[PDB]
Design a binder for this molecule. Structure first.
Ligand SMILES: *[C@@H]1O[C@H](CO)[C@@H](O[C@@H]2O[C@H](CO)[C@@H](O[C@@H]3O[C@H](CO)[C@@H](O)[C@H](O)[C@@H]3O)[C@H](O)[C@H]2NC(C)=O)[C@H](O)[C@H]1NC(C)=O
Ligand SMILES: *[C@@H]1O[C@H](CO)[C@@H](O[C@@H]2O[C@H](CO)[C@@H](O[C@@H]3O[C@H](CO)[C@@H](O)[C@H](O)[C@@H]3O)[C@H](O)[C@H]2NC(C)=O)[C@H](O)[C@H]1NC(C)=O
Ligand SMILES: *[C@@H]1O[C@H](CO)[C@@H](O[C@@H]2O[C@H](CO)[C@@H](O[C@@H]3O[C@H](CO)[C@@H](O)[C@H](O)[C@@H]3O)[C@H](O)[C@H]2NC(C)=O)[C@H](O)[C@H]1NC(C)=O
Ligand SMILES: *[C@@H]1O[C@H](CO)[C@@H](O[C@@H]2O[C@H](CO)[C@@H](O)[C@H](O)[C@H]2NC(C)=O)[C@H](O)[C@H]1NC(C)=O
Ligand SMILES: *[C@@H]1O[C@H](CO)[C@@H](O[C@@H]2O[C@H](CO)[C@@H](O)[C@H](O)[C@H]2NC(C)=O)[C@H](O)[C@H]1NC(C)=O
Ligand SMILES: *[C@@H]1O[C@H](CO)[C@@H](O[C@@H]2O[C@H](CO)[C@@H](O)[C@H](O)[C@H]2NC(C)=O)[C@H](O)[C@H]1NC(C)=O
Ligand SMILES: *[C@@H]1O[C@H](CO)[C@@H](O)[C@H](O)[C@H]1NC(C)=O
Ligand SMILES: *[C@@H]1O[C@H](CO)[C@@H](O)[C@H](O)[C@H]1NC(C)=O
Ligand SMILES: *[C@@H]1O[C@H](CO)[C@@H](O)[C@H](O)[C@H]1NC(C)=O
Lengths: 89, 423, 100, 50, 50, 44
């Protein structure tokens, strides 16, 4: 889930205080809470590896279901492979 | 019988600014109409799926805006990089290429464009939110850099197959042949052309920096979105015939029946305000889509190619274009060939030699008062009239306005140089 | 109803300028300064553009001029005779009138 | 192995008609809804900036 | 309704301007863009609202 | 890629050697002169 426009600290506090309006809870264990510019993403593990975008989240960040068993992984999307052109005179 | 032919030329750079994307908004329909009020929400349920339709319309717009950005900028198969030595025949691209010394890795022109146009939605935070773009400004800058590196090092090859390196002056030589000017014009005048290009780019920076209205097309989009949201928020203060604009006061003083009447008046007014806002956003989205489709077409035909369409890629004969990223849009720098310093020459449709009509193969017959020469149409370069430069079709009498002049056949003179006496 | 910013005379002047430019300079005036060229040579270049050699125009110049003049006369007869020829503009006028 | 090639040609002129502009209109909102009526205008003010 | 009509007229005007630039001020290789046949040249004429 | 011999028919001449930046030295073959040479120049 993505809580849009909110800090992960505010969401965590609202969870601990039993203030958040929806009554469902995501496990929200270690490494599954990641702060994006779009909002607080809970239930996805951020990886440094960049991959092509699958499910867009926002502000450059995408997520997909990957084998690492499998889980939902959040990542910064790749724009393409690099190709340095052998330019010369 | 009078034709004017350029004896010089100017390399000109013009700027075209196009919107690509619109601010992506979302609305919590229930919070806007019936914020923190159960009674109002229950009355709102009797109007059917209006909030659902409004949500779908705004979601569709947001997705469309990401589609527009993706279609305009993500047109390159690979992220291309320039060589470590920024030497391209004497052409200076340092003002359009990314500057590695600054964060965001944008070019000087892109920084100017970003500075001229003006995360947490502290303002208008009444159930109205703004979603970030899917691609960040850095990602757009990377696509622009890849497109520039591709164009500079590979010309149009990378846009229709694999990227193939070519020296930049030869890329220009082919672009000159495209407009209809021979390669030797570029090579003999290569330094002049590079100097005119560099001057034109400096003028682009001075023009955009000096004139505050240069980017009005993008600022108008930002301002119209701001006005639409300021109006939508302002409408919450209207009473629409109710005793009060605040639902909490209506519920605080009145019993359910009267509160329901006053709330229905407010629900009707707020719902009309949201329906108007969404309709306006859909119309604006259609306009932005058309602009984004034009920008993508120009990206493909002006930057990844060379276009023969008049005024499509700027005024003059098109040579090449360079994209630059801008907030909510794209700026194209169009490099064109502009004829200059024309001279008036006498012309003729054909030359009569020995009863035969000679026509130019690739050029125009001109006369400098006393002598006839063949020149290319877009650049004065007189050449001797020969059997290689012209073709023969029909007799002399048929062409209207035909003139008498010698057509030189190199073969016969060469044969005459070889002794005909034999003994 | 607000008047247009450009009057019908101003639009006619722009059209006349465009016709004078095209007729006397071909495409040169649209991408740089206007350069005069004799009209038959402008057509010769237009023929090369489509992929027909210049001698076809010059040998058949009178036929081409006659066909052009005939076609223009036919344009006037077609537009004058058929009341529906301009429906695309009349529909705009009618839709604005219906809306008001 | 058969190709057809023109031996003659015709110069043709066709007509294309395109709209460019629409009648420019303006509306006095207050006069249309509440013409020459102060009481109606005062009620109209409660609907906000329509 | 006027905004929707304005969008349609804008699209038409943009097409007319493109045709003015590519058909009248140039020569176009685009099939059927500047009429049927191989394009030679075009001439504009003013008309009410178009 | 389709390599061909550099000839006076494949290329055109404009200006002298010195003006072009990066010009290289290579033979340009003129078929006419070789053909002429095949036709006996001795005459006797
Ligand atoms: C390609 O062009 C750039 C400029 O367009 C050349 O780099 C240097 O850019 C600065 C821009 O600021 C030029 O002016 C400088 O301005 C500051 C004040 O802003 C002043 O304190 C400096 O003394 C200088 O005047 C600078 O002149 C320019 N360099 C030169 C040699 O003119 C870049 O060198 C060009 N690349 C090549 C390969 O020529
Ligand atoms: C075609 O036009 C170009 C310009 O559009 C001509 O090049 C220009 O030639 C003039 C005179 O030679 C240059 O002016 C000189 O500039 C130097 C700069 O240091 C200055 O010291 C001199 O006192 C004088 O002002 C001008 O800069 C130059 N422009 C460029 C861009 O190089 C060219 O000669 C013309 N060719 C023909 C055949 O007409
Ligand atoms: C190619 O086609 C054109 C027409 O599209 C041919 O020109 C036409 O030739 C005929 C016969 O020579 C002309 O008809 C004659 O017109 C005169 C007018 O005074 C009339 O008195 C005669 O009794 C007869 O009707 C016709 O007008 C003419 N069309 C034009 C526009 O000039 C041309 O000959 C054809 N060429 C070839 C090689 O097939
Ligand atoms: C037209 O051009 C021709 C050749 O381009 C000019 O003739 C040359 O003029 C120069 C003048 O210094 C002489 O040195 C050459 O020997 C001339 N060559 C020939 C073949 O005549 C001619 O003068 C030019 N005329 C005008 C009016 O510009
Ligand atoms: C080009 O030269 C030819 C001759 O080679 C000219 O033809 C002559 O024109 C005169 C005009 O009075 C006639 O009397 C001769 O009988 C013609 N001779 C031939 C062989 O045709 C022709 O007029 C010249 N054209 C121009 C424009 O000067
Ligand atoms: C191409 O060949 C010419 C000679 O035919 C070279 O010109 C000579 O260059 C040397 C360089 O030191 C000079 O000393 C000679 O005086 C030049 N002679 C002439 C007649 O110009 C030219 O440099 C060669 N070019 C290349 C790239 O090798
Ligand atoms: C969230 O709050 C912490 C509090 O220390 C702050 O450091 C962080 O920058 C905040 N992030 C956002 C996105 O608001
Ligand atoms: C191209 O030539 C210039 C001449 O100054 C030189 O500095 C540059 O290094 C050359 N490029 C390569 C790739 O050798
Ligand atoms: C064109 O050149 C001729 C001389 O060749 C001159 O008489 C005429 O006035 C010139 N026209 C213009 C517009 O420069």
């Amino acid at each position: 889930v993505l809580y849009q426009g909110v800090n992960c600290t505010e969401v965590s506090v609202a969870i601990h205080a039993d203030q958040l309006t929806p009554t469902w809870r995501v496990y929200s264990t270690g490494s599954n809470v990641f702060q994006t510019r779009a909002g607080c993403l809970i239930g996805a593990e951020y990886v440094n590896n960049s991959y092509e975008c699958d499910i867009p989240i926002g502000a450059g960040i995408c997520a997909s279901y990957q084998t690492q068993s499998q889980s939902i992984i959040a990542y910064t999307m790749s724009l393409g492979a690099e190709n340095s052109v052998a330019y010369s005179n | 019988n009078s034709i004017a032919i350029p004896t010089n030329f100017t390399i000109s750079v013009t700027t075209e600014i196009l919107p690509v994307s619109m601010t992506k908004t979302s609305v919590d329909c229930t919070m806007y109409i019936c914020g923190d009020s159960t009674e109002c929400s229950n009355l709102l349920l009797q109007y059917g799926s209006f909030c659902t339709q409004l949500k779908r319309a705004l979601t569709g717009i947001a997705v469309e805006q990401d589609k527009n950005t993706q279609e305009v900028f993500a047109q390159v198969k690979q992220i291309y990089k320039t060589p470590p030595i920024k030497y391209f025949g004497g052409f200076n691209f340092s003002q359009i290429l990314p500057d590695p010394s600054k964060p965001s890795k944008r070019s000087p022109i892109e920084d100017l464009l970003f500075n001229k146009v003006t995360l947490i939605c502290a303002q208008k935070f009444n159930g109205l939110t703004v979603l970030p773009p899917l691609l960040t400004d850095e990602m757009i800058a990377q696509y622009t850099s890849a497109l520039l590196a591709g164009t500079i090092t590979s010309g149009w090859t990378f846009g229709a197959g694999p990227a193939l390196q070519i020296p930049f002056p030869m890329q220009m030589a082919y672009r000159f042949n495209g407009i209809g000017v021979t390669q030797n014009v570029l090579y003999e005048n290569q330094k002049l052309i590079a100097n005119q290009f560099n001057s034109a780019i400096g003028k682009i920076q001075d023009s955009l920096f000096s004139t505050p209205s240069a980017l009005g097309k993008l600022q108008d989009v930002v301002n119209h979105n701001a006005q639409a949201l300021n109006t939508l928020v302002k409408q919450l203060s209207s009473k629409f015939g109710a005793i009060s604009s605040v639902l909490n006061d209506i519920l605080s003083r009145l019993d359910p029946p009267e509160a329901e009447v006053q709330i229905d008046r407010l629900i009707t007014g707020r719902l009309q305000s949201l329906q108007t806002y969404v309709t306006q956003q859909l119309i604006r989205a259609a306009e932005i889509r058309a602009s984004a489709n034009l920008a993508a077409t120009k990206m493909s035909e002006c930057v990844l190619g060379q276009s023969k369409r008049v005024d499509f890629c700027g005024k003059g004969y098109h040579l090449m274009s360079f994209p630059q990223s801008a907030p909510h849009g794209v700026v194209f720098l169009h490099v064109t060939y502009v004829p200059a310093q024309e001279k008036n020459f006498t012309t003729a449709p054909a030359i009569c030699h020995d009863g035969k009509a000679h026509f130019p193969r690739e050029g125009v017959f001109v006369s400098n008062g006393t002598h006839w020469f063949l020149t290319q149409r877009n650049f004065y370069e007189p050449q001797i009239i020969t059997t290689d430069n012209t073709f023969v079709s029909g007799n002399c009498d048929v062409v209207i306005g035909i003139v008498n002049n010698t057509v030189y056949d190199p073969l016969q003179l060469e044969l005459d140089s070889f002794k005909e006496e034999l003994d």
